Amino acid sequence: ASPFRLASAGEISEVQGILRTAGLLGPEKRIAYLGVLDPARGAGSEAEDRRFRVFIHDVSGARPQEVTVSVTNGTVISAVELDTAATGELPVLEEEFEVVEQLLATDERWLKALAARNLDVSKVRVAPLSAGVFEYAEERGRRILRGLAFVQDFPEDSAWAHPVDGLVAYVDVVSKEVTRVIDTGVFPVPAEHGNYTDPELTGPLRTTQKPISITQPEGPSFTVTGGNHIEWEKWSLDVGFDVREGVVLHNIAFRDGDRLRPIINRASIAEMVVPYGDPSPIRSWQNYFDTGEYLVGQYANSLELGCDCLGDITYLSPVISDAFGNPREIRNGICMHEEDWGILAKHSDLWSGINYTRRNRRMVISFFTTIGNYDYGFYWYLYLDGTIEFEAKATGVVFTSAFPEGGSDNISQLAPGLGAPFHQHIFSARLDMAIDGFTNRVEEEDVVRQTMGPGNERGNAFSRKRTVLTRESEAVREADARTGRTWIISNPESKNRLNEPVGYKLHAHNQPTLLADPGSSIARRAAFATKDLWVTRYADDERYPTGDFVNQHSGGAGLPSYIAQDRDIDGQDIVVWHTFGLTHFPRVEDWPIMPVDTVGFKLRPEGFFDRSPVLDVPAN
Amino acid sequence: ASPFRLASAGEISEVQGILRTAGLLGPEKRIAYLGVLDPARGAGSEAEDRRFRVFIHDVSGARPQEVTVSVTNGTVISAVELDTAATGELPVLEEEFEVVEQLLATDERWLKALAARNLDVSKVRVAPLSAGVFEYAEERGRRILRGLAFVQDFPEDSAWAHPVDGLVAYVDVVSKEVTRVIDTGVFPVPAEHGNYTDPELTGPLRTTQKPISITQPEGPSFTVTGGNHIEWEKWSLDVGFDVREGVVLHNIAFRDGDRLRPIINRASIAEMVVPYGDPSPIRSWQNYFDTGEYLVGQYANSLELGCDCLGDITYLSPVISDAFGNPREIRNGICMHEEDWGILAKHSDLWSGINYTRRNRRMVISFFTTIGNYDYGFYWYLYLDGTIEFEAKATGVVFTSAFPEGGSDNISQLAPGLGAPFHQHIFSARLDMAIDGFTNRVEEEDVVRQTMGPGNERGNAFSRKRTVLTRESEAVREADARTGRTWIISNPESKNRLNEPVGYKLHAHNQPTLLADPGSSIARRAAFATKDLWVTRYADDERYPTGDFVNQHSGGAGLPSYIAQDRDIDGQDIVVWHTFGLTHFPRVEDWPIMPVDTVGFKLRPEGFFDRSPVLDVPAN
Ligand SMILES: [Cu+2]
Ligand SMILES: [Cu+2]
Ligand code: NA
Ligand code: NA
Ligand code: NA
Ligand code: NA
């Protein structure tokens, strides 16, 4: 009955049937995106309407379409032809990846470049990468992928150990033509293998690790109802899944006494960009928008018990659409479980004689995705004390190149002749806030240092200041770790028992933001990533910080266009967009497979409750 | 046989006997500090000499002494009379705490101040706090504690809920005289109780938490030999315990192939300061040096199974000296166990068909201490991939005051009439480095942004720069989160297989440092806390960033005096001192007992290994 339930296989099948009967899903059509739409603001009517948004690609060259369908009514609500030179190309299709390697395999320029290097074409894998927007006027309005080559010595070989530097090709994947092959010179293909399951590389495996057994003899403390509704330790939420964004959290609320108090209306990772910092023309165009260009949800892994998720695990298995509109289940694609989290609160009081210790725990909701060489884990945490935390886990195999003779200012050496270009992994969290309801505001909180003098005779005082952001034009903020800068989202019309507005405090990790020159293509396409915090007024169609169509889209759309409306955000329905990321200078220890590195953020209650919300936790 | 073994009850008893027979431990003497000395540099002779350092207080007013004793020989090696007006007073004695309240209970000025407020003296608890150095010339050379009052309504009442503001007393604890009683005006004593085990405050306890069972059916993966030597997953170390510093880690090394490779020679939290930022004269003098003035090790808790430490726990029970030289065991004062730590490395490769997942774990070594209202957990972590991490956990009851009518810029309101002054908790980690041996250096690594132009035509390149710190005068560094600043400790005479110096990278949390005016007493006594990173040349007697005698010591000693020697630190035996802390603006949720907040730092391998050190971890 819940409007926020996961899409069903039956719904996707109805969507396929509605599109087909409407004439919109002929043999030359492909579904490049399909997803359920959230209910619009003011849905207390119970007049539910399950609608899906669909991007339809055409492999013959005809214009793609954006289509909105009502499953509940069985109708096409709207269908628009897209001018992709203007508004951007559709996301990359899984079936287009293999096209690149097949097309290059019969191109005379490509074969000529491989012959010069004595490489067997049957052993050359091509990584199909998004193209971006640069100086090539012939690419505008076409679907281009760019290809970089790696040698696979045998079927189970790790091709990433053998990059073919100095060589790159551009491919029009609709007309099936290789537009350019650029060969800047022969580099030795690095010879060492990177096969991390080869006994001659690992050595004898350890026999020293004794097992750790985590079990829940009475089952877990959370309940799942209606497929995706979670209740756990006073928290209430709905777990969504979208093929672009992945896990989306809806209706995050906390049961305080007998009031269910809203906190966050929708939480998601709405974009992630991976810009590379190597100025070689072979790679200087390389920027992955994993969310916007590739859709991270469609490459979610099936998570294995005892390996990927340890403990008493509850799985969700979301359903997505394939390119033809058939439903596809991602078996065990979301893990949910609770974890012990050490000490929650502890005091031994000399005067009262009372010794008191309570333990903390957290609820974990996670999925893992694989895009080529990269693997990313997305983790959402709910803590007993009201803290909400997001953590991204980055692993997989680093993207490689040749390491040039004479070194490099922009590439790390991993092995003889093998390099790893510098890069960043930058995320955008979109937090549609609802602190005790939808009337919210954001204040920026800085520590304030005070000068020794009258009123501060011993020079020990320090304070803080809070600045309300009142309009979108002043709501583009940067971090300042040195002044302990945080941001507070409050409800000015909801007060705690001390008559202070209730709030939550966002704590950032204060990592560097986008490093590229401000005049670069990537700085214009990934403008969100140049600033730590953006606050917009809620609008139905303002979903992604990069806009709806990121692939080969020139720039401007997304957050810079939204904030130019300069809307009132002081006690209004607002959306916080937080940029955070890792700057990766690869180390020898990252090779041949990288140990996990992490980045994230958290929100903690700030006078939201009238006292500690965990006084009723028992000793156990 | 190991020179780094824990002190035994037998050793402390021998120390007591040696002091007594030497005439240095008469009835008027008290031991204010006793601890084993580390072996000096170059101890390959096997000529072990177990020596103890002792601070001896005299309750009759005679000069205290510093004494060094050889247990192995049974001799007094040296004994020096201390001039405390010059070099500082001895640490506060546990027996001096109760003296403050007893003395004030018969002082006419104190009783007069309590009578004006209608407070029964039998119900008034006095927090005995360290005095620092301010404007009172009569305090120089005397042992002063300052007292702040709280009302306990009944024996099991939390006195912290009832501060008596506007009132403070100073007490000479050797002459047993109240030097000053300052009454600045009557504030209402806050009436609400803060009794977090009272059912009328907690409400009915939760019945929703199902148990989490963590067990190790084959026992733990680490071994303990010689009382305190740990071997675990290629790590090797010795766990020390000192009454001042607490847990100290010795000889941290990693088994790489068949080489035992040193990393850190000694790791400890060598000071921690808690400065308060309220300019009221009642509290503007308030600064706790928990390590230097109080000795955090002597107030270590006994940790309970299933509550404080969960899982398959191995305990150490360190022995310390009481004030008379009798040995005292801190039963179960150190917890040691291993914890699952999620995914270590994961990749699903399309081209090779190989799916690979390995899990991480960490070794945990921890203790908890209680100083008055405060409780602190100290946690050291060793990870499979070579990462070392420290985490401090802050909980307990916030220090309280009245909340003034008309508000405050320096105090938070927690409850009707109840305030919590702003403050910081700042730690100093002393890392005696030994990266592949003792020839080390420190480089500061900043991200470098590059301008679009020739050689960087697309404006995407970025780089990094490393600056070697060559002499102590240039080795006082500050954080720069915006430029991703880290510090690398390398060995320039030990290279990895790519012929790069091996190293470890220190990652700071980049929290604010000391906020007090630079001209303040606390900024001069806690100079270490004004800067994020200091590097000194190793010296036997340079143990603490604040010097040996912190209590009532005027300033200068410690790190500013050490670095004025301007010694060579470029490929030498060096010590890294890292400052890190929490700036605490108390929130309503911190009352009546505070949920844990955390701060720390970590060190990760940076080309220390020739590839990932965790390829030989099995799938399990
Ligand atoms: Cu990376
Ligand atoms: Cu605090
Ligand atoms: Na355009
Ligand atoms: Na909102
Ligand atoms: Na002095
Ligand atoms: Na050293």
Tab-separated table of C-alpha atoms in Angstrom, chain A residues 295-493:
chain	number	residue	atom	x	y	z
A	295	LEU	CA	24.137	4.349	-13.589
A	296	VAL	CA	25.743	2.717	-10.537
A	297	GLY	CA	22.627	0.790	-9.514
A	298	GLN	CA	22.579	-1.399	-12.591
A	299	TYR	CA	26.021	-2.822	-11.805
A	300	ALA	CA	25.227	-3.672	-8.161
A	301	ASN	CA	26.846	-6.923	-6.999
A	302	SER	CA	25.050	-9.913	-5.536
A	303	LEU	CA	26.397	-9.930	-1.965
A	304	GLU	CA	27.541	-13.265	-0.516
A	305	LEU	CA	26.821	-14.373	3.038
A	306	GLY	CA	29.886	-14.685	5.250
A	307	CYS	CA	32.087	-12.840	2.741
A	308	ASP	CA	30.493	-9.519	1.772
A	309	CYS	CA	28.025	-9.295	4.669
A	310	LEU	CA	28.838	-10.934	8.005
A	311	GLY	CA	26.311	-11.619	10.750
A	312	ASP	CA	22.511	-11.994	10.754
A	313	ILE	CA	21.819	-10.454	7.340
A	314	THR	CA	18.484	-9.491	5.818
A	315	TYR	CA	18.643	-9.048	2.052
A	316	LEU	CA	16.646	-6.969	-0.356
A	317	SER	CA	16.617	-8.050	-4.011
A	318	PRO	CA	15.628	-5.019	-6.092
A	319	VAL	CA	14.185	-5.373	-9.584
A	320	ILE	CA	15.349	-3.220	-12.501
A	321	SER	CA	14.639	-3.137	-16.234
A	322	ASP	CA	16.946	-4.529	-18.873
A	323	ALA	CA	17.423	-2.718	-22.189
A	324	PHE	CA	14.258	-4.319	-23.582
A	325	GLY	CA	11.944	-3.683	-20.639
A	326	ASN	CA	12.160	-7.170	-19.122
A	327	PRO	CA	12.418	-7.202	-15.323
A	328	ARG	CA	15.725	-8.289	-13.862
A	329	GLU	CA	16.310	-9.138	-10.217
A	330	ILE	CA	19.563	-8.170	-8.502
A	331	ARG	CA	19.614	-11.093	-6.071
A	332	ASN	CA	20.827	-10.117	-2.576
A	333	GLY	CA	21.853	-6.708	-3.846
A	334	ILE	CA	21.246	-4.871	-0.552
A	335	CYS	CA	22.501	-6.033	2.855
A	336	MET	CA	20.781	-4.888	6.053
A	337	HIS	CA	21.986	-5.771	9.538
A	338	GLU	CA	22.799	-4.297	12.926
A	339	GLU	CA	26.326	-4.071	14.358
A	340	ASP	CA	27.688	-3.615	17.851
A	341	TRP	CA	29.402	-0.249	18.001
A	342	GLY	CA	31.415	-0.213	21.203
A	343	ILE	CA	30.652	2.006	24.191
A	344	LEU	CA	27.692	4.384	23.939
A	345	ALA	CA	28.038	6.186	27.284
A	346	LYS	CA	30.075	5.475	30.408
A	347	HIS	CA	30.642	7.127	33.776
A	348	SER	CA	31.949	5.928	37.154
A	349	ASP	CA	30.963	8.552	39.715
A	350	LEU	CA	33.029	8.833	42.880
A	351	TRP	CA	30.416	10.786	44.830
A	352	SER	CA	27.326	8.748	43.966
A	353	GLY	CA	28.998	5.338	43.851
A	354	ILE	CA	27.071	4.479	40.662
A	355	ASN	CA	28.967	2.796	37.810
A	356	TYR	CA	27.209	2.964	34.462
A	357	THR	CA	28.081	1.554	31.048
A	358	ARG	CA	25.887	1.194	27.965
A	359	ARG	CA	26.801	-0.179	24.565
A	360	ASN	CA	26.107	1.406	21.192
A	361	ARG	CA	24.929	-0.224	17.997
A	362	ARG	CA	24.254	0.784	14.439
A	363	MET	CA	21.941	-0.302	11.662
A	364	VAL	CA	23.791	-0.810	8.364
A	365	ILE	CA	22.251	-0.575	4.873
A	366	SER	CA	24.689	-1.202	2.051
A	367	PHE	CA	25.299	-2.233	-1.534
A	368	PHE	CA	28.399	-2.668	-3.716
A	369	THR	CA	28.835	-1.691	-7.354
A	370	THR	CA	31.483	-2.512	-9.969
A	371	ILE	CA	32.271	-0.167	-12.866
A	372	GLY	CA	35.114	-1.637	-14.908
A	373	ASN	CA	38.226	-1.715	-12.708
A	374	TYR	CA	36.578	0.143	-9.837
A	375	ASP	CA	34.499	-1.251	-7.009
A	376	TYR	CA	32.568	1.003	-4.600
A	377	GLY	CA	30.657	0.178	-1.435
A	378	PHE	CA	27.888	2.540	-0.303
A	379	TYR	CA	27.049	2.332	3.421
A	380	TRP	CA	24.302	4.137	5.351
A	381	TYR	CA	24.415	3.940	9.165
A	382	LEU	CA	21.810	4.753	11.825
A	383	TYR	CA	23.043	4.995	15.427
A	384	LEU	CA	21.133	4.684	18.700
A	385	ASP	CA	21.898	8.296	19.656
A	386	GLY	CA	20.297	9.842	16.535
A	387	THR	CA	23.469	10.115	14.427
A	388	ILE	CA	23.153	9.445	10.682
A	389	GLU	CA	26.327	8.623	8.756
A	390	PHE	CA	27.270	7.813	5.186
A	391	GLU	CA	30.446	6.009	4.227
A	392	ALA	CA	31.824	5.244	0.792
A	393	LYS	CA	34.350	2.406	0.439
A	394	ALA	CA	36.662	2.484	-2.591
A	395	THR	CA	38.503	-0.663	-3.695
A	396	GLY	CA	39.124	-2.650	-6.867
A	397	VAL	CA	42.071	-2.225	-9.266
A	398	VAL	CA	43.633	1.193	-9.881
A	399	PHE	CA	43.499	2.477	-13.459
A	400	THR	CA	46.956	2.114	-14.956
A	401	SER	CA	49.322	3.580	-17.540
A	402	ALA	CA	52.947	3.287	-18.503
A	403	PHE	CA	55.350	4.908	-16.086
A	404	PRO	CA	57.504	7.191	-18.250
A	405	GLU	CA	61.260	7.062	-18.277
A	406	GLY	CA	62.389	10.058	-16.283
A	407	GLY	CA	59.389	10.028	-13.973
A	408	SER	CA	56.207	12.039	-13.819
A	409	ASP	CA	54.605	14.795	-11.763
A	410	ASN	CA	51.126	13.324	-12.364
A	411	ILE	CA	51.571	9.517	-12.217
A	412	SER	CA	52.716	7.130	-9.451
A	413	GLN	CA	54.930	4.125	-10.141
A	414	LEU	CA	53.415	0.825	-8.957
A	415	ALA	CA	55.765	-1.710	-10.542
A	416	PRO	CA	58.533	-1.783	-13.175
A	417	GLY	CA	57.277	0.326	-16.072
A	418	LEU	CA	53.756	0.501	-14.557
A	419	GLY	CA	52.120	3.757	-13.482
A	420	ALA	CA	48.844	4.926	-11.936
A	421	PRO	CA	47.616	8.441	-12.838
A	422	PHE	CA	46.549	10.763	-10.034
A	423	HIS	CA	42.791	11.231	-9.697
A	424	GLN	CA	39.918	12.068	-7.350
A	425	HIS	CA	36.697	10.279	-6.377
A	426	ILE	CA	34.100	12.920	-5.545
A	427	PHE	CA	30.543	12.299	-4.344
A	428	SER	CA	27.467	14.519	-4.088
A	429	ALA	CA	24.982	13.673	-1.328
A	430	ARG	CA	21.541	15.188	-1.913
A	431	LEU	CA	19.716	15.552	1.419
A	432	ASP	CA	16.101	16.618	1.061
A	433	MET	CA	15.776	17.769	4.666
A	434	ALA	CA	12.682	17.565	6.859
A	435	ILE	CA	13.805	18.478	10.403
A	436	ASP	CA	10.506	18.163	12.348
A	437	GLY	CA	8.766	18.987	9.068
A	438	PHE	CA	9.529	20.961	5.948
A	439	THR	CA	10.141	24.464	7.340
A	440	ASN	CA	13.928	24.367	7.636
A	441	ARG	CA	16.895	26.691	7.392
A	442	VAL	CA	20.672	26.300	7.288
A	443	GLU	CA	23.145	28.153	9.501
A	444	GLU	CA	26.917	28.125	9.059
A	445	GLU	CA	28.702	27.744	12.406
A	446	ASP	CA	32.286	28.949	12.847
A	447	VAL	CA	34.410	28.946	15.974
A	448	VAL	CA	35.199	32.505	17.104
A	449	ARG	CA	38.520	33.321	18.761
A	450	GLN	CA	38.577	36.184	21.247
A	451	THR	CA	41.298	38.666	22.132
A	452	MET	CA	42.629	38.986	25.659
A	453	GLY	CA	41.292	42.194	27.169
A	454	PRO	CA	38.342	43.698	29.040
A	455	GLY	CA	35.717	41.045	29.684
A	456	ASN	CA	38.309	38.351	28.838
A	457	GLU	CA	41.137	39.288	31.194
A	458	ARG	CA	42.836	35.856	31.202
A	459	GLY	CA	42.587	35.362	27.421
A	460	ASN	CA	40.784	32.017	27.687
A	461	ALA	CA	37.365	32.758	26.197
A	462	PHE	CA	36.249	31.444	22.844
A	463	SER	CA	32.834	31.409	21.247
A	464	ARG	CA	31.041	30.617	18.005
A	465	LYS	CA	28.918	32.448	15.476
A	466	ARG	CA	26.037	31.261	13.328
A	467	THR	CA	25.137	32.810	9.969
A	468	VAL	CA	21.727	32.081	8.463
A	469	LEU	CA	21.733	31.443	4.722
A	470	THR	CA	18.613	33.256	3.509
A	471	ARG	CA	18.688	33.019	-0.302
A	472	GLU	CA	20.179	30.592	-2.781
A	473	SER	CA	22.726	33.114	-4.076
A	474	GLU	CA	24.531	33.128	-0.709
A	475	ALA	CA	24.158	29.395	-0.062
A	476	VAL	CA	27.244	28.143	-1.920
A	477	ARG	CA	29.680	27.474	0.914
A	478	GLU	CA	33.205	26.165	1.328
A	479	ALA	CA	34.781	24.252	4.189
A	480	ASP	CA	37.041	25.834	6.764
A	481	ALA	CA	38.564	23.124	8.946
A	482	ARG	CA	40.718	25.656	10.785
A	483	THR	CA	37.656	27.447	12.168
A	484	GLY	CA	35.837	24.162	12.855
A	485	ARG	CA	33.126	25.092	10.374
A	486	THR	CA	29.914	23.016	10.404
A	487	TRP	CA	26.385	23.606	9.103
A	488	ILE	CA	23.199	23.332	11.171
A	489	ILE	CA	19.813	22.526	9.658
A	490	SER	CA	17.107	23.717	11.999
A	491	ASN	CA	13.355	24.190	12.120
A	492	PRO	CA	12.680	27.766	13.322
A	493	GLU	CA	9.044	26.864	14.079
